[PDB]
Design a protein around this ligand. Structure first.
Ligand SMILES: Nc1ncnc2c1ncn2[C@@H]1O[C@H](COP(=O)(O)OP(=O)(O)O)[C@@H](O)[C@H]1O
Ligand SMILES: Nc1ncnc2c1ncn2[C@@H]1O[C@H](COP(=O)(O)OP(=O)(O)O)[C@@H](O)[C@H]1O
Ligand SMILES: Nc1ncnc2c1ncn2[C@@H]1O[C@H](COP(=O)(O)OP(=O)(O)O)[C@@H](O)[C@H]1O
Ligand SMILES: Nc1ncnc2c1ncn2[C@@H]1O[C@H](COP(=O)(O)OP(=O)(O)O)[C@@H](O)[C@H]1O
Ligand SMILES: [Mg+2]
Ligand SMILES: [Mg+2]
Ligand SMILES: [Mg+2]
Ligand SMILES: [Mg+2]
Ligand SMILES: [Zn+2]
Ligand SMILES: [Zn+2]
Lengths: 273, 53, 273, 270, 273, 52
């Protein structure tokens, strides 16, 4: 076995993955400086841990082009990592918050006719709770749209919205690897944005309802290692988003689950076929 | 003492102030004291295009 | 007399300026491509008309470095063209809307403590009503500051705010050139942002009060040709902003005032020194 | 038969497409302001003509989500529209310029060791071509990487490069729709960037053959294909799934609008 | 004596300045989150240490507007911190590298006709060697101009160039405070860009000519605390740049000079002015 | 010259480089980008410091 690990900066999780691998074979740590294609790589599988979602996507696609499978795959990174593509994949299979997509400012202005106020504006590619807006009225909708317009990253031309969901001071982050539920946590905050990157605090979640719902969400994609963001609402659990570059250090700490180890197992599994 | 967010090591930095820059004695990480009441280190925010001298 | 005119595109204003300049002497049309410094220019004055505020400022300064006086001057273009530097010079001299400035996102959160809601957010270097936001609550303030944070231009990190002024469906645009009031218009709109660049409709304004206030606002600066923006409010007239690269095609059409001619006459006066 | 056309501005191409589509049934002109999802759309096929590639991609996917096929598909728009994904797809099938991809500036600094100087730097998503750079030495490489770094658009973290191909003062743009070659032009210029009245038809039988083989690497849709002549023969540089054709239609006289619509009605019929 | 220090983060510099200031009177540490105007400040002087150049500039002006003198002044922060305004001020008084400024891509294309290749392109407001490019030919010039055009910041459209100076593996960094030379270093690097920020190595410089030239360069501004950049060339010493928010921790360590104390002593001199 | 917006051949007459004109037929705002020969283009994009 030769397991590649692709990384931006060496930290707890990457180092945890390194040691769980290596129990299976030789581990090759690949800094982004080491990634050059076309190239001669002798690896059975690559675990994709690049911090940038986009670098992760292209890294996955490039290793695949050299006939080297990848966890997660380029297809899954693409579909799961983009919020709109993701909710489209989820739409049939699990409850999601009510959502709307428009392709211009004028269309976006019609969104609150469907969703009502308050609603949530967010970028399709974002993470760590960045550029989230809770929009309470037309003046705010206009402001957010004005500012998106002047950012001139073409991605912000896709206007994705959700109803504002009234959560009970927290949300849920669950982990499914190769279809197996490995653990869940609560993320607490008295701000509506509950990210641990944003100062959220993690506790263990044992609710079997979310375990069931997590596996169902994973199954809508049918592959990979995913972190799954769930809201509790007045109308039951809702799957907000999925994430193909699962951060887990707090989740593993607070749950006692071996996310690192499960991830590596799945990768050796992926290396077989 | 306090935990370095890059390395994981427990380190003594002495009598620091809020927003003060510290270098980790183990891994050499450049860090910002982002809180004192609960003593918290953090990696620096991104360099902006007008940062400097 | 050799009169330079610096320009990006030749709008109606620039063509009128060119015609009038030709009555007083030889006109040298200087597109941006023609500007290279240090250089050899034979010019008694330059009328600065670049569409970019920053290109106007730098081209004025460069001509001054060649000993060629400039209308407007680099100092006036910088101070008048910046919302914050301009209100600082207006403060104590004429009435202005209540304002507040912060130097970080965390500081800006405290602005409603003084100003209450709703408030107006605007960038320090903008024009044409660009990136103006009406902020009615904390969630909107957060959204605006989140977006400003992630915009590249460091200038968006200077946070300038005013109280929202309840205007009677319009505001006032007046012109003062070398201390002489030259005319004024109302700009009507059913949106709170009234710029003619955004659909604002020009109508002549003959209130004797705006004339005196306009001259006093100009005297706060003490030089140049300024388009001044004034608001009617329940507490009387307030000076909002001054503008050092005046547009006037709608104002001249609607008042009959020859803003172009007056601008050139002032330029000829500065050429004499 | 109900044919939708999505657009940003109504120009010659869109009006031409509308006219040909009118022959086969009802035409629904969809400005970007009319695109709102989820929604109820009564359409058998949508011809995607949004000017932004990113908007094109998302509108195609969104129509697909409502069970409405799209020309081009969201899959082709991404695979063919991204330079890196596209050359990976072409590499097995047709000759391409030597190329290199790196995921950091440190890796990108080793690219000249493979490609030599001069080399060409370009973004993976670009189409206007304002960010193309002919890099003659290490100082220029560093300058390009340093500027891309400060654009802080994470798509510039994919560093894609090609060898500089010495072309004979022109290049080739061909059109293949549904597997059929419909025409080709030469684009002349005295600058190495030839991108488009210096165009004329190209009747080299070899570009027709190569053009079809290039299209077959994707196996669907309406594509514009960019081909270089070189000392070592024809090379496929890139494919373009949003296909501007107004110039090529006039120059070649080919009914590009009509061929596009015909393909869309065949697609509409599943 | 109440001495304000305005800061983003507390580097060695700011820690040393705080120490020195405490020996003369009461120190008020003012983080950016603390800065709110108009405000009620009770300060005899403010030492401006914000990491952002534009935040430094605007906070200086705001304190000046409260009647509180500032080190450095807003006028000096702007002029010294802009490469082009600084070069204009230096050009009378001290040798500088040959330079050109253009206002469009078209005009920038003619710059090689004056300066020859290789030339250096740099943004007017940067620091730490950021966006410096060595342009050896037309192809690189075009690439550089094309990228600057696409960048959001309108300031990147002001095209400032210099002849490439062939330095002997280093440049010179000197410090003048209130007209007094306080020390200098060489900054060594294997790369042509020598800033300690990336990361040149500091050695003490006792060259009396750099002392004389540094004082002359300071006198072209006539105030404040400046870090001066000087190049050695086959034609002698050339003054490149001046910096109004000096870093000095390496310079201090390597020279043994008390930059921090001198800055604070000057600040107490302006407080009593 | 042909208007780049509507495709029509139009009459402009005495005009200068970088002058903003209006198409007689479709009423589009256009910039004279060249006089070698007379070439019209649509307005360039607004930048974040454009205006008065
Ligand atoms: N529609 C919504 N209603 C309520 N809270 C939301 C909504 N969308 C996001 N949030 C909150 O913000 C957090 C971050 O949003 P998310 O959609 O996960 O974006 P990111 O990918 O940046 O984390 C969520 O964990 C949740 O707490
Ligand atoms: N505080 C305010 N209250 C009410 N309306 C405002 C306020 N600030 C701006 N506006 C409206 O927006 C327009 C543009 O704002 P202004 O401050 O003049 O910026 P710009 O330089 O973009 O014109 C004004 O003419 C006015 O109609
Ligand atoms: N590797 C190369 N060698 C030589 N010329 C090139 C190369 N790449 C691009 N060009 C020139 O620049 C033009 C535009 O490049 P292209 O790769 O198509 O970017 P875009 O997607 O912006 O059209 C090409 O048509 C060709 O004339
Ligand atoms: N014209 C030039 N010739 C040679 N080296 C230069 C030139 N301009 C800058 N440099 C190098 O790059 C460094 C940074 O440039 P500088 O102009 O000081 O900008 P900054 O404000 O980013 O320090 C200089 O210290 C010097 O080593
Ligand atoms: Mg204005
Ligand atoms: Mg205004
Ligand atoms: Mg500097
Ligand atoms: Mg320097
Ligand atoms: Zn450490
Ligand atoms: Zn027309």
């Amino acid at each position: 076995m030769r397991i590649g690990i692709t990384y931006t900066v060496l930290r707890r999780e990457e180092m945890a993955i390194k040691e769980r691998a290596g129990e299976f074979g030789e581990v090759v740590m690949l800094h982004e400086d080491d990634l050059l294609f076309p190239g001669n790589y002798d690896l059975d599988v690559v675990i994709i841990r690049n911090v940038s979602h986009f670098k992760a996507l292209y890294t996955a696609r490039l290793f695949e082009s050299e006939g080297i499978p990848t966890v997660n795959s380029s297809r899954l990174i693409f579909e799961a990592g983009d919020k709109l593509f993701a909710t489209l994949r989820l739409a049939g299979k699990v409850p999601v918050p009510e959502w709307k997509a428009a392709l211009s400012e004028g269309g976006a202005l019609r969104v609150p006719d469907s969703l009502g106020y308050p609603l949530v504006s967010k970028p399709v590619f974002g993470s760590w709770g960045r550029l989230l807006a809770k929009v309470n009225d037309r003046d705010s909708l206009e402001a957010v749209l004005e500012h998106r317009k002047w950012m001139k990253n073409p991605l912000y031309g896709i206007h994705y919205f959700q109803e504002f969901v009234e959560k009970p001071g927290r949300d849920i982050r669950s982990y499914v690897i190769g279809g197996e539920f490995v653990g869940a946590i609560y993320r607490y905050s008295n701000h509506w944005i509950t990210n641990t990157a944003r100062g959220g605090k993690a506790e263990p979640c044992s609710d079997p309802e979310v375990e069931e719902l997590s596996v169902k969400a994973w199954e809508a994609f049918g592959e990979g290692a995913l972190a799954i963001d769930i809201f509790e609402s007045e109308k039951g659990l809702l799957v907000n988003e999925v994430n193909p570059n699962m951060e887990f250090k707090n989740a593993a700490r607070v749950t006692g689950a071996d996310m690192a180890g499960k991830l590596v197992e799945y990768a050796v599994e992926v290396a077989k076929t | 003492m306090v935990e370095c967010p890059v390395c994981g090591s427990e380190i003594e930095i002495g009598e620091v102030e809020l927003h003060q820059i510290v270098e980790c004695p183990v891994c050499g990480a450049e860090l910002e004291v982002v809180s004192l009441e609960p003593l918290t280190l953090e990696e620096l925010p991104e360099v902006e295009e007008d940062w400097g001298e």
